[PDB]
Structure 1
Amino acid sequence: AKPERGRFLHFHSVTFWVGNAKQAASFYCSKMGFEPLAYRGLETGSREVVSHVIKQGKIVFVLSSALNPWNKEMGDHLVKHGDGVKDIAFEVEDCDYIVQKARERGAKIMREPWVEQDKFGKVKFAVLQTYGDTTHTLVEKMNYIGQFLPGYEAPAFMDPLLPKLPKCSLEMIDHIVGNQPDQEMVSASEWYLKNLQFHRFWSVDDTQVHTEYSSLRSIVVANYEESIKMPINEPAPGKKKSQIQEYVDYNGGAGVQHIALKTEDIITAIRHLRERGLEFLSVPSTYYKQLREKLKTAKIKVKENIDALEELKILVDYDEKGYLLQIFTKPVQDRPTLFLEVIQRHNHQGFGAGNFNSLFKAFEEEQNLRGNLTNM
C-alpha cells in the first residue's frame, strides 16, 4: 500500500556524537577515504557544539562534540555509549505530512518542523525519536543548492595527506543496522511501519542465523520505494551470549551497530582501505574452497577474481538472479559497539542469509577474543 503523501528519498547523513570531533573526522578521512565537506564551531559562531562534516561519494558523516565542560545531553550520551551514532537523517519530500502522520500514529517529535535559510536557499527539518537515544532528522530541501546545509561553513582545514592516499571508491550508504535489547526487535521495527509507513522487507530467525553457540533474529524495514533499508536485530537463544547482547552490554542500550557503505569496485575498495590501515574481520580458508565448489552449479557467475576475494576476506552470497559481496570492519572504537561494512551488489537489492550467517560467525570469533562469548 503506497503512502498517501510524502517520500523518503535517501539517507541524507549520519551524525555521530564523539569525544573528539577533530580526531574522529581525521580517522574517517585517513582510514576510510573521506574528505572534509563542512564545519561549524567557535570560529564560525557555534559556541556549544562543534561539527566536522566529511563526505565520500554521496556518504555524509557529521562528527560532533560538546565545546564546553559539563554538557549534560552530550556528556551523558558520551559516558553511556562512548563514541557512536546519534542521528540518522533522511532526505524527504513533504516533511510536514510525514511529521503529522507520525505524531497521529504515536511517534515522539523531539523537534517540531523548522526552516533554516542561507544564500543558497531554504531547508526544512524535523526530529523524531527512534530506538534508544537514536533520532531521525528529516531534511527537506526547498530549492537549496548549497554543498551541505545552512549553518555550516567551509572546512576548518584541508589535510594535505589525503590526496596522496589511494581512493576507496565508496559511493553511498546502503543500509544501517540497529541492535535492540532482548524482545525489542518487534517494537523497534513496528515503529517504522506504524509511524513512517515503512514496510517489512526481509527477516531471519535464529533457525537461519546461528553458530553452534549463539544466534540472533532480524527484521529489515524499508520505505515504500525501498531506497532506505534498516535491519533491526535482537539477541536470540543459544548456549552462549549473542553478539547482539554484547552490543547492548557495551552500548548501554539500543543503538546503531553498523553502517554499510556501497561500492561498485569492492576489490579496489578493500585493497585501498587495507593500505590506509583499516582492519577487517577474517574468514577461514575452507570457506573459499567451499565457495569455488558451490559456484560450479550456481545460476549466477561471479565476475570478480575469486583469488582476490579470498585474499581480501570478502564474503559472497547469491540467489538465482544475482549476488552480494560483503565485508565487515573491526569496531571503530574499543568498546565492541559500532563497525562498518562495505557491500557491492550485482543484480541483488536484498540480503542473503548465507552472508548473514558468515558475517555473524566472523563477528563471533572476535566476541570470543574479547571474553564475551560467555555461557548463558
Structure 2
Amino acid sequence: ADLYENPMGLMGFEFIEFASPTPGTLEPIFEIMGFTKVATHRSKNVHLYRQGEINLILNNEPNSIASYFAAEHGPSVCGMAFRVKDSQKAYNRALELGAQPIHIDTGPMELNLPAIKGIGGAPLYLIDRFGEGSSIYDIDFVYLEGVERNPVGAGLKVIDHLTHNVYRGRMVYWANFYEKLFNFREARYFLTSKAMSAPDGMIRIPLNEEGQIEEFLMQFNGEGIQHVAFLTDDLVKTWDALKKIGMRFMTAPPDTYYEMLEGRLPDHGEPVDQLQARGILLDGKRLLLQIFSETLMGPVFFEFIQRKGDDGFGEGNFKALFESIERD
C-alpha cells in the first residue's frame, strides 16, 4: 500500500465510533460539525452519520462494549475501524503477534466485526467491506427514505488524523503497538509527541504524553482519543459553513498572532484578514491552516485542517501562540 510495507493491507480509516452514558448529547455535536444522520442499524440502537468520506458511528446499544466504555469515560470515541483488504488475513496475524481480541456481539443475519483491544481498551475494528453497495453500512444498516446517500455537509472530506493521549512512559508502549502490529513508522522531523504514520499513507495517529495532556487523562479517566482532525479543501469556506449550523470554536488568537505571520511565515500568501476574522491558525513553501473546536465530548475536541504543502500537525502554533500572548 501507498507508502511502505503494508503487511496488514491498511486502506485508511473506515469509521470512528462514539457513545455517551447521557442520551441526546452526541447527536447535536455531530450536527454542528456538519455531519448528517443517513442510516440506522438493522437491529441495534446504532446510527450512521456521514460527511464526505467520513463515517461516524453513534453506538447507543445498551449493555454493550461501547456503553461500558462510555460509562467509564463519558462521551467518547469508543471504537475505531481500520480499512483493510482482507479482514481475516489481518485479524489472525494481529492475534499471532499477540493482540487481545474483543468480542463484539453480533445479531442473527448481521456481520461479525473482528476487533482487537486498542487504546484505552477501545475496540479496533478491521473492516474489509467498503464502497457504495458492498460496504458494511449497506449490509447491516438501513438508509433513511430518500436521503442524500453521500452528504457533503460543511466540506469535511476525510479523517486526517486522530491523536491518543497516553500516560507518562506509555508512548513507547503504544508506538510499539502500532509498529509491531500494523508496521506504522514514526515519521520524524528536524510537550512530547510521536507522529505514528501508517503504511497506507492515510492513517496518522500521533501519540502524546505530557497541563493539557494530564488534564485529558483525568477528565477522560484513562488513555484515549483526544481529538479527531477533519480535512477540508477550503477551511475558510468550511468555517463559514460550520458557524451557520452552530459550531463553537476555540477563541481566536490575539491580533499580535497575525502581525508575526509575515515574520514567522514569509510569503505564505494567505488572506490574513479572513483568517483573523475567524481565528484560523496557520503553520508552515509548505503551509497548513487549522482551527479547533472547544471540548465537546468531555475533554475530547475536534480539529479542522486544510493542508497547503505542510504535512505536519501545526506544532509551530504553540510557540506562535505563546509568543503572541507575550507581546499582547
TM range (shorter): 0.7 to 0.9
TM-score, L = length of structure 1: 0.75
SS in 2 for 1:141: coil
CA distance in 2, matches of 1:158, 1:197: 39
Instruction: Please report how far the alpha carbon of residue 158 of structure 1 lies from its aligned counterpart in structure 2 after TM superposition.
Output: 6.6
Counterpart pick for 2:221 among 240, 252, 259 = 252
- Map 1:37-76 → 2, pairs under 5 A: 37-40=38-41, 44-46=42-44, 50-67=45-62, 71=63, 73-76=65-68
Counterpart in 2 of 1:179?
A: 165
Query: What amino acid maps onto 1:90 in structure 2?
Result: F
Residue 371 (structure 1) aligns with = none
Decide whether the 8 Å contact of 1:94 with 1:140 is kept in 2: yes
| Conserved 8 A contact 1:38-1:54 | yes
Hey, what does 1:126 align to over in structure 2?
114
- Offset of 1:110 from its aligned partner? 1.9
Matches within 5 A, 1:163-178: 167-178=153-164
- Deviation digits for residues 235-293 of structure 1, max 9, x if unmatched? 1xxxxxx2110000111110000000000111111122122221111312111011133
Structure 2 residue 29 is matched with structure 1 residue 27: yes
* CA distance 1:310–1:222, change in 2 (3 Å): same
For 1:117 and 1:201, locate their aligned partners in 2 and report how far apart those are by CA, in whole Å.
42
**Residue 286 (structure 2) aligns with:** 322
Give, as a single letter, the amino acid of the residue that structure 2 aligns with 1:229. R
Q: Aligned residue for 2:258?
A: 288
How do residues 221-260 of structure 1 correspond to structure 2 at under 5 angstroms? Answer: 221-235=196-210, 242-260=211-229
SS in 2 for 1:324: strand
* Residues 58 and 171 in structure 1, CA contact (< 8 A), matched pair in contact too: yes
The 3-state SS of whatever aligns with 2:154 is coil
Q: Matched residues in 2 for 1:357 and 1:11: separation?
A: 31
1:4 is displaced (CA, Å) by 6.6
Report the equivalent of 2:313.
Answer: 351
Unaligned runs of 5+ in 2: none
User: Structure 1 residue 91 and structure 2 residue 66: aligned?
Assistant: no
Shift in Å, 1:356: 5.2
The answer as to whether partners of 1:261 and 1:342 remain within 8 angstroms in 2 is yes
Change (3 A) 1:350 1:129: same
**Count of aligned residue pairs for this structure pair:** 317
Contact 1:110 1:129 in 2 (8 A): yes
Question: More strand by proportion, 1 or 2?
Answer: 1
> Structure 1: which 4+ aligned runs deviate by more than 4 Å?
20-23, 72-75, 156-159, 356-359
Q: Which has the higher contact order (CA 8 A, sep 6+)?
A: 2
Conservation of the 8 A alpha-carbon contact between 2:59 and 2:66: no
Decide whether aligned partners of structure 1 residues 197 and 111 sit closer, same or farther in structure 2, where only a CA change above 3 A counts: farther
Contact 1:203/1:218, CA 8 A, preserved across alignment: no
SS at match of 2:178: helix
Tell me how large the CA RMSD over aligned residues is: 3.2
Amino acid at match of 1:325: L
Give the 3 Å change call, closer, same or farther, for CA 157–36 of structure 1 in structure 2. Answer: farther
Counterpart of 2:58 in 1: which secondary structure? strand
Corresponding position of 1:210: none
Q: Deviations over 1:131-154 (max 9, x none)?
A: 212221111028872462422112
The one-letter code matched in structure 2 to 1:150 is: I
Deviation of 1:98 after TM superposition, in Å, equals: 1.9
Q: Separation in 1 of the partners of 2:263 and 2:156?
A: 30
Change (3 A) 1:278 1:144: closer
Q: Following the alignment from structure 1 to structure 2, what is the Cα–Cα distance between the partners of residues 271 and 221?
A: 32
- The equivalent of 1:194 in structure 2 is 180
User: Is residue 338 of structure 1 aligned with residue 300 of structure 2?
Assistant: yes
Cα deviation for residue 22 of structure 1 reads: 5.2
Q: Which amino acid aligns with 2:214?
A: Q
Asked if 2 retains the 8 angstrom alpha-carbon contact of 1:202 and 1:221, the reply is no
| In structure 2, distance between residues paired with 1:72 and 1:103 | 22
Q: Distance in 2 between matches of 1:167 and 1:143?
A: 19
